Each structure stands twice: as structure tokens, then as C-alpha cells.
Design a protein around this ligand. Structure first.
Ligand SMILES: NC(=O)c1ccc[n+]([C@@H]2O[C@H](COP(=O)([O-])OP(=O)(O)OC[C@H]3O[C@@H](n4cnc5c(N)ncnc54)[C@H](OP(=O)(O)O)[C@@H]3O)[C@@H](O)[C@H]2O)c1
Ligand SMILES: O=C(O)Cc1c(Cl)cccc1Cl
Length: 309
């Protein structure tokens, strides 16, 4: 139920996402998640709720429901902190809000660096930084040497950007994970095949198609009749099928939910198996549709989505 990372740690295949989870609902959501059995929580500074996520974690550690070593906490470095001197500072802010002394995994959220400041998305659309991916990676590597994070990774990096880090002169720490958008409408067969051949674990975000995305005629995965049929045959819900889908592709999945019953439902995905036919069918539903396309950074020198994969 856990995947081995290149650093020797074991990462729980199922995690709870926290993007869009209200500050007044995520503490209770994480508390319930931990009781239900979740041991992996996906976080990020830009989500503006790590302090509240941290409240839930501390309560459970205090209750002794779990030990710190049983939990796998993940967070990400936002685009406005790509400078060499701003990385440790961003990581420490997150550690304070979460009320932890170390993170299990720290990811470079997006390959695009923005102008450092108060705005998460600085504008003039989007002011870039002259920093590059290799300089930021070297700063991430220092976080490991100082003991702030157990492992470092990337997110939304295309194969060429992943290659750039892998061929870095004096590369000390290899990216442990590449978190990307993945579901039946954006299968990512090529990037997943690429990352998995390099010992990099793939985490699939927006597994249900992110039905509550801020940007709202759009296609719905949870409402797809073809996927509802597969779910009925296994007597499961379409969400459990959509969550079981990446698991059988050897991917870590992090569905988001602030609803106790759905959080519990999303956990009941270990007692069934999708046939090889069900899998091939789900893969054929690919349309190359993205929920997160970073539209504002279309002309950024490091925009990841111009290459095929
Ligand atoms: N690295 C990145 O750039 C990046 C980008 C996007 C997301 N992520 C991470 O990936 C996580 C998951 O992706 P996501 O938030 O985009 O969305 P998602 O998990 O695809 O979908 C979340 C939505 O699905 C609903 N849902 C959850 N369980 C359901 C169920 N069993 N039945 C019906 N509906 C259900 C939730 O409603 P309720 O919450 O109301 O139950 C919420 O509206 C994020 O929270 C974040 O941690 C990372
Ligand atoms: O970048 C993320 O993780 C989530 C995200 C944010 Cl914070 C804002 C707009 C779109 C998306 Cl996909």
C-alpha cells in the first residue's frame, strides 16, 4: 500500500489533497482522514490553509492515533520563491504553519519562476523571474542537507525539464517524485512511462477531474456514462473507480475532499480490482484535457506544456 522512493522512504499510495479546502473545514477533514486511515496529506503554501492542516496533524499526534513517522506530509515551493536566497525561507514558513520540524517530501510546485513579492501571481500577464530550474534545484538540495525535508521533487515538469535536472552537473539528489495532472481525460502515458523508467514516482492530481475548480460546457468525469458502467459492474462508485485507476498504474493518488462520508468512501479502494479490460478502456478515454494549464504563463520561458510530454 506504499511505494518505495529513491531515498528509501515509503510513500502511501493514497493521500488527501487540500487545494480548495476551506480553512474552516480542512482541520476537521484531515482529522477524519487520519482516523479513517489516511497517512499521506498533500499540502502547499499557495493553498493558504497549511496552518489549519497543521492543527489537525498536531491533535492526532497528541491523541497518539499516529506517530510522526507513520505520516507522510507533502508541500510545495511556490513560484515566487525560486531565488536561491528565498527557498529555505519558504520551506521554513510551511514547516511553521504545519507545526512540524521536517517534511517528508518538498516539491517545486511549477517550473516557472515569478517575480518575488507578495502577489502569488505578479502582474504588469505574469512577471517572470530570470532564475532557472537548475539554480532552484540546487537550493532544494540544500534543504535535504540541512534536514528540513527528507526528499525533494518536482511538479508539472515536462520530460525535457525532468531531463535537465537529471543531466545537471554535480547532481546530488535525484527528484523523488513528479506530481502531475492525471485521470481518464489526460492519461499521460508518455510522461508516466518516462518518469517511471528513471526511478521517479508519479503522483496523479485532480484524479476526479477537479469538479470544484475555480475556473468552472466542460466535461465531467464523475458523470461519464462509460465510467459509471464500469463502477456499477464492480458495485463501487465512479469516484472509487477513478481513484483505483491510477493505483493500478503504480501511481500515488491524492483525491481532495472536505466531506467525511466521501473521505471514507475514497478510502475503500483496496478491496477490489479493475480488470485489464477495464484499464485499457479507461485509457482509451484520453482527450488531452487539462484542468491546470497555467494559462497566464503561456509565454513564460519555462512554460511546461508546449512540448508533447
Ligand atoms: N501540484 C499541483 O500543481 C496540483 C494542482 C492541482 C491539485 N493538486 C493536488 O491534488 C489534489 C486533488 O486534485 P483536485 O483538488 O484538483 O480535485 P479532485 O480530487 O479531482 O476533486 C476534488 C473535488 O471532487 C469532489 N469529490 C471528492 N470525493 C468525491 C466523491 N467520492 N464523490 C463525488 N465527488 C467527490 C470534492 O468535493 P468535496 O470536497 O466537497 O467532497 C471536490 O469537489 C488537490 O487538492 C491538491 O492537493 C496539485
Ligand atoms: O497550482 C496548484 O496547485 C493549484 C492551482 C492554484 Cl493554487 C490556482 C489556480 C489553478 C491551480 Cl491548478
Amino acid at each position: 500500500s506504499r511505494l518505495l522512493l529513491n531515498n528509501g522512504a515509503k510513500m502511501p499510495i493514497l493521500g488527501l489533497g487540500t487545494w480548495k479546502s476551506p480553512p474552516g473545514q480542512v482541520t476537521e477533514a484531515v482529522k477524519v482522514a487520519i482516523d479513517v486511515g489516511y497517512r499521506h496529506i498533500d499540502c502547499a503554501h499557495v493553498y493558504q490553509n497549511e496552518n489549519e492542516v497543521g492543527v489537525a496533524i498536531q491533535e492526532k499526534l497528541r491523541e497518539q492515533v499516529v506517530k510522526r513517522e507513520e505520516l507522510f506530509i507533502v508541500s510545495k515551493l511556490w513560484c515566487t520563491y525560486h531565488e536561491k536566497g528565498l527557498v529555505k525561507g519558504a520551506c521554513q514558513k510551511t514547516l511553521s504553519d504545519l507545526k512540524l520540524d521536517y517534511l517528508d517530501l518538498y516539491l517545486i510546485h511549477w517550473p516557472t519562476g515569478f517575480k518575488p513579492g507578495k502577489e502569488f501571481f505578479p502582474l504588469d500577464n505574469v512577471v517572470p523571474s530570470d532564475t532557472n530550474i537548475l539554480d532552484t534545484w540546487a537550493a532544494m538540495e540544500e534543504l535535504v542537507d540541512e534536514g528540513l525535508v527528507k526528499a525533494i521533487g518536482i511538479s508539472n515538469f515536462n520530460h525535457l525539464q525532468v531531463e535537465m535536472i537529471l543531466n545537471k552537473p554535480g547532481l546530488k539528489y535525484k527528484p523523488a517524485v513528479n506530481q502531475i495532472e492525471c485521470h481518464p481525460y489526460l492519461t499521460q502515458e508518455k510522461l508516466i512511462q518516462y518518469c517511471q523508467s528513471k526511478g521517479i514516482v508519479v503522483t496523479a492530481y485532480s484524479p476526479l477531474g477537479s469538479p470544484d475548480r475555480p475556473y468552472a460546457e466542460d466535461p465531467s468525469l464523475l458523470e461519464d456514462p462509460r465510467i459509471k458502467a464500469i463502477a456499477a459492474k464492480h458495485n463501487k462508485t465512479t469516484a472509487q473507480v477513478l481513484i483505483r485507476f491510477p493505483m493500478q498504474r503504480n501511481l500515488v493518488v491524492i483525491p481532495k475532499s472536505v466531506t467525511p462520508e466521501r473521505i471514507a468512501e475514497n478510502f475503500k479502494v483496496f478491496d477490489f480490482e479493475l480488470s485489464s479490460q477495464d484499464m485499457t478502456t479507461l485509457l482509451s478515454y484520453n482527450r488531452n484535457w487539462r484542468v491546470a494549464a497555467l494559462l497566464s504563463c503561456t509565454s513564460h520561458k519555462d512554460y511546461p506544456f508546449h512540448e508533447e510530454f
